[PDB]
Protein backbone atom coordinates (compact mmCIF):
# COMPACT_ATOMS: atom_id res chain seq x y z
CA UNK A 1 0.00 0.00 0.00
CA UNK A 2 1.13 3.61 -0.49
CA UNK A 3 2.58 5.75 2.30
CA UNK A 4 1.47 9.39 2.15
CA UNK A 5 4.03 11.78 0.65
CA UNK A 6 7.10 13.05 2.63
CA UNK A 7 7.40 16.64 3.86
CA UNK A 8 10.68 18.25 4.86
CA UNK A 9 11.36 21.46 6.78
CA UNK A 10 14.30 23.23 8.40
CA UNK A 11 14.10 23.67 12.14
CA UNK A 12 15.10 27.06 13.46
CA UNK A 13 16.90 26.72 16.79
CA UNK A 14 18.27 25.42 19.15
CA UNK A 15 21.68 27.00 19.06
CA UNK A 16 23.52 29.26 21.43
CA UNK A 17 24.11 32.69 20.00
CA UNK A 18 27.28 32.53 17.98
CA UNK A 19 30.16 34.88 17.05
CA UNK A 20 28.30 37.45 15.04
CA UNK A 21 24.88 36.42 13.77
CA UNK A 22 21.64 38.33 13.35
CA UNK A 23 19.91 38.12 16.73
CA UNK A 24 16.48 39.55 17.49
CA UNK A 25 15.10 40.26 20.96
CA UNK A 26 11.54 41.11 21.97
CA UNK A 27 9.86 42.77 24.94
CA UNK A 28 6.12 42.42 25.28
CA UNK A 29 3.86 44.37 27.65
CA UNK A 30 0.05 44.39 27.91
CA UNK A 31 -1.30 47.93 28.13
CA UNK A 32 -2.14 49.89 31.25
CA UNK A 33 -3.28 53.48 31.76
CA UNK A 34 -1.51 55.53 30.71
CA UNK A 35 0.09 53.40 27.93
CA UNK A 36 3.69 52.87 29.11
CA UNK A 37 6.89 53.39 27.16
CA UNK A 38 8.99 50.28 26.62
CA UNK A 39 12.76 50.59 26.29
CA UNK A 40 15.68 48.22 25.94
CA UNK A 41 18.69 48.90 28.17
CA UNK A 42 22.20 47.65 27.46
CA UNK A 43 24.65 48.57 30.24
CA UNK A 44 22.10 50.83 31.97
CA UNK A 45 21.87 53.14 28.96
CA UNK A 46 18.74 53.58 26.84
CA UNK A 47 19.24 51.87 23.49
CA UNK A 48 17.93 53.56 20.35
CA UNK A 49 14.93 51.41 19.47
CA UNK A 50 11.25 52.10 18.79
CA UNK A 51 8.29 50.62 20.66
CA UNK A 52 5.10 49.69 18.81
CA UNK A 53 1.64 49.52 20.37
CA UNK A 54 -1.29 47.76 18.76
CA UNK A 55 -4.43 49.81 19.41
CA UNK A 56 -6.76 46.83 19.00
CA UNK A 57 -4.84 44.46 21.30
CA UNK A 58 -3.49 47.08 23.74
CA UNK A 59 -0.21 45.15 23.67
CA UNK A 60 3.05 47.12 23.57
CA UNK A 61 5.96 45.31 21.92
CA UNK A 62 9.61 46.34 21.42
CA UNK A 63 11.66 44.47 18.81
CA UNK A 64 15.45 44.90 18.82
CA UNK A 65 17.71 43.28 16.22
CA UNK A 66 21.51 43.28 16.34
CA UNK A 67 24.54 41.19 15.36
CA UNK A 68 26.00 39.18 18.24
CA UNK A 69 29.41 40.16 19.64
CA UNK A 70 32.13 38.48 21.62
CA UNK A 71 33.12 41.74 23.39
CA UNK A 72 29.77 41.82 25.14
CA UNK A 73 26.67 39.68 24.79
CA UNK A 74 27.73 37.41 27.59
CA UNK A 75 26.02 40.16 29.58
CA UNK A 76 22.42 41.26 30.08
CA UNK A 77 19.86 43.32 28.12
CA UNK A 78 17.14 44.86 30.27
CA UNK A 79 13.62 46.00 29.45
CA UNK A 80 11.90 48.81 31.33
CA UNK A 81 8.30 49.97 31.61
CA UNK A 82 7.65 53.58 32.52
CA UNK A 83 4.67 55.31 34.19
CA UNK A 84 5.59 58.74 35.63
CA UNK A 85 6.73 58.58 39.27
CA UNK A 86 9.45 51.18 36.67
CA UNK A 87 8.65 47.56 35.81
CA UNK A 88 11.80 45.81 34.62
CA UNK A 89 12.90 42.46 33.16
CA UNK A 90 16.53 41.72 32.29
CA UNK A 91 18.06 39.04 30.06
CA UNK A 92 21.52 37.43 30.15
CA UNK A 93 22.72 36.08 26.80
CA UNK A 94 25.18 33.33 25.95
CA UNK A 95 27.37 33.81 22.89
CA UNK A 96 29.86 31.27 21.55
CA UNK A 97 33.03 32.70 20.05
CA UNK A 98 36.55 31.50 19.22
CA UNK A 99 39.66 32.49 21.21
CA UNK A 100 41.03 35.72 19.76
CA UNK A 101 44.71 34.91 20.33
CA UNK A 102 47.16 33.26 22.73
CA UNK A 103 50.06 34.48 24.87
CA UNK A 104 53.33 32.63 25.49
CA UNK A 105 55.63 33.16 28.49
CA UNK A 106 59.29 32.21 28.85
CA UNK A 107 62.96 32.94 28.23
CA UNK A 108 64.19 33.76 24.73
CA UNK A 109 67.57 32.32 25.66
CA UNK A 110 68.31 29.12 27.60
CA UNK A 111 71.60 27.48 28.61
CA UNK A 112 72.48 24.18 26.92
CA UNK A 113 71.76 21.11 29.04
CA UNK A 114 69.28 23.06 31.12
CA UNK A 115 65.53 22.67 30.80
CA UNK A 116 62.88 25.34 30.19
CA UNK A 117 59.24 25.90 31.19
CA UNK A 118 56.85 27.57 28.74
CA UNK A 119 53.42 28.91 29.72
CA UNK A 120 50.53 29.69 27.37
CA UNK A 121 47.34 31.55 28.19
CA UNK A 122 44.63 32.05 25.62
CA UNK A 123 42.44 35.11 25.27
CA UNK A 124 38.89 34.67 26.65
CA UNK A 125 36.63 32.37 24.63
CA UNK A 126 33.33 30.54 24.87
CA UNK A 127 33.33 27.78 25.42
CA UNK A 128 36.76 26.92 26.92
CA UNK A 129 39.57 26.33 24.46
CA UNK A 130 41.88 23.32 24.27
CA UNK A 131 45.56 24.20 24.37
CA UNK A 132 47.87 22.07 22.24
CA UNK A 133 51.60 22.30 21.69
CA UNK A 134 53.77 21.66 18.66
CA UNK A 135 57.55 21.51 19.13
CA UNK A 136 59.84 21.46 16.07
CA UNK A 137 56.98 20.45 13.80
CA UNK A 138 55.99 17.68 16.18
CA UNK A 139 52.74 17.59 18.13
CA UNK A 140 53.40 16.72 21.77
CA UNK A 141 51.25 14.95 24.39
CA UNK A 142 48.78 17.52 25.70
CA UNK A 143 49.52 18.78 29.24
CA UNK A 144 46.77 19.14 31.84
CA UNK A 145 45.28 22.64 31.57
CA UNK A 146 43.80 25.13 34.02
CA UNK A 147 40.62 26.96 32.99
CA UNK A 148 39.68 30.31 34.52
CA UNK A 149 36.35 32.12 34.40
CA UNK A 150 36.43 35.76 33.43
CA UNK A 151 33.71 38.20 32.48
CA UNK A 152 32.40 37.36 28.99
CA UNK A 153 34.36 34.12 28.59
CA UNK A 154 36.81 31.43 29.77
CA UNK A 155 40.63 31.47 29.82
CA UNK A 156 42.68 28.31 29.30
CA UNK A 157 46.25 28.02 30.54
CA UNK A 158 48.88 25.34 29.98
CA UNK A 159 52.51 24.80 30.98
CA UNK A 160 55.00 22.84 28.89
CA UNK A 161 58.58 21.83 29.63
CA UNK A 162 61.34 21.75 27.01
CA UNK A 163 64.63 20.06 27.87
CA UNK A 164 67.77 20.97 25.92
CA UNK A 165 69.53 17.94 27.40
CA UNK A 166 67.74 15.65 24.95
CA UNK A 167 68.75 17.90 22.04
CA UNK A 168 72.18 17.70 20.40
CA UNK A 169 75.05 20.05 21.22
CA UNK A 170 74.53 21.46 17.72
CA UNK A 171 70.92 22.50 18.44
CA UNK A 172 70.59 26.21 17.70
CA UNK A 173 67.03 27.02 18.70
CA UNK A 174 63.75 25.43 19.73
CA UNK A 175 60.43 26.32 18.09
CA UNK A 176 57.60 26.36 20.61
CA UNK A 177 54.14 26.65 19.09
CA UNK A 178 51.02 27.12 21.19
CA UNK A 179 47.44 26.68 19.98
CA UNK A 180 43.99 27.33 21.48
CA UNK A 181 40.94 25.66 19.94
CA UNK A 182 37.20 25.51 20.52
CA UNK A 183 34.23 24.58 18.24
CA UNK A 184 34.12 28.14 16.93
CA UNK A 185 37.75 28.42 15.88
CA UNK A 186 41.44 28.38 16.73
CA UNK A 187 44.44 30.70 16.99
CA UNK A 188 48.18 30.04 17.27
CA UNK A 189 51.38 31.87 18.22
CA UNK A 190 55.04 30.83 17.98
CA UNK A 191 57.84 31.72 20.41
CA UNK A 192 61.47 31.07 19.50
CA UNK A 193 63.98 30.08 22.19
CA UNK A 194 67.68 30.45 21.42
CA UNK A 195 70.22 28.13 23.04
CA UNK A 196 73.19 29.83 24.71
CA UNK A 197 76.41 28.29 26.04
Ligand SMILES: *[C@@H]1O[C@H](CO)[C@@H](O)[C@H](O)[C@H]1NC(C)=O
Pocket residue numbers: 022024065
Ligand atom coordinates in the same frame (compact mmCIF):
# COMPACT_ATOMS: atom_id res chain seq x y z
C1 LIG B 1 18.83 41.23 10.55
O1 LIG B 1 17.42 41.08 10.62
C2 LIG B 1 16.74 42.35 10.69
C3 LIG B 1 15.27 42.05 10.89
O2 LIG B 1 15.07 41.09 11.91
C4 LIG B 1 17.02 43.16 9.42
O3 LIG B 1 16.44 44.45 9.57
C5 LIG B 1 18.52 43.30 9.18
O4 LIG B 1 18.76 43.90 7.91
C6 LIG B 1 19.20 41.93 9.25
N1 LIG B 1 20.65 42.08 9.12
C7 LIG B 1 21.44 41.16 8.55
C8 LIG B 1 22.90 41.50 8.50
O5 LIG B 1 21.01 40.11 8.10
Ligand SMILES: *[C@@H]1O[C@H](CO)[C@@H](O)[C@H](O)[C@H]1NC(C)=O
Pocket residue numbers: 035036037082083084
Ligand atom coordinates in the same frame (compact mmCIF):
# COMPACT_ATOMS: atom_id res chain seq x y z
C1 LIG C 1 9.11 58.14 31.17
O1 LIG C 1 7.88 58.12 30.46
C2 LIG C 1 7.45 59.32 29.81
C3 LIG C 1 6.09 59.01 29.22
O2 LIG C 1 5.64 57.72 29.61
C4 LIG C 1 8.49 59.70 28.78
O3 LIG C 1 8.08 60.88 28.09
C5 LIG C 1 9.81 59.93 29.49
O4 LIG C 1 10.82 60.26 28.54
C6 LIG C 1 10.25 58.68 30.26
N1 LIG C 1 11.44 58.97 31.04
C7 LIG C 1 12.46 58.12 31.20
C8 LIG C 1 13.60 58.61 32.04
O5 LIG C 1 12.46 57.01 30.68
Ligand SMILES: *[C@@H]1O[C@H](CO)[C@@H](O)[C@H](O)[C@H]1NC(C)=O
Pocket residue numbers: 119144146159
Ligand atom coordinates in the same frame (compact mmCIF):
# COMPACT_ATOMS: atom_id res chain seq x y z
C1 LIG D 1 52.87 27.14 35.35
O1 LIG D 1 54.00 27.95 35.66
C2 LIG D 1 53.68 29.10 36.46
C3 LIG D 1 54.95 29.92 36.60
O2 LIG D 1 55.17 30.73 35.45
C4 LIG D 1 53.10 28.66 37.80
O3 LIG D 1 52.76 29.80 38.59
C5 LIG D 1 51.88 27.78 37.57
O4 LIG D 1 51.39 27.28 38.81
C6 LIG D 1 52.23 26.62 36.65
N1 LIG D 1 51.05 25.81 36.37
C7 LIG D 1 51.11 24.50 36.08
C8 LIG D 1 49.79 23.83 35.82
O5 LIG D 1 52.17 23.89 36.03
